[PDB]
């Protein structure tokens, strides 16, 4: 009843433990924390992109920063400041409705 979240697109689910990357963390505003594999050399795009494919939420509903820094897509980890925990903070954001 008066959901907005669609079908959770599962971007991996194998190899947890067999495979040179770290697992970030997302937290999300609605008490969610989804764990994923990447590289630190990775694109910031497939981090955003894979939070929201989770969860099944628009794009413009949620906004990911990092200690006030805008995340976009030919971003680093290690030029944003990422640390081991390469974990990012949500705002719940709407444009419009």
Do not use: W
């Not at 194998?14 to 590289?39: A, M, N, P, R, W």
């Not at 944003?80 to 719940?92: A, C, F, R, S």
């Amino acid at each position: 009843m008066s959901d907005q979240e669609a079908k959770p697109s599962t971007e991996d689910l194998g190899d947890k433990k067999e495979g040179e990357y770290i697992k970030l963390k997302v937290i999300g505003q609605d008490s969610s924390e989804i764990h994923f594999k990447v590289k630190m050399t990775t694109h910031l795009k497939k981090l955003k992109e894979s939070y929201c494919q989770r969860q099944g939420v628009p794009m413009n509903s949620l906004r990911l920063l990092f200690e006030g820094q805008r995340i976009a897509d030919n971003h680093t980890p290690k030029e944003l400041g990422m640390e081991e925990e390469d974990v990012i903070e949500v705002y719940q954001e709407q444009t419009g409705g």
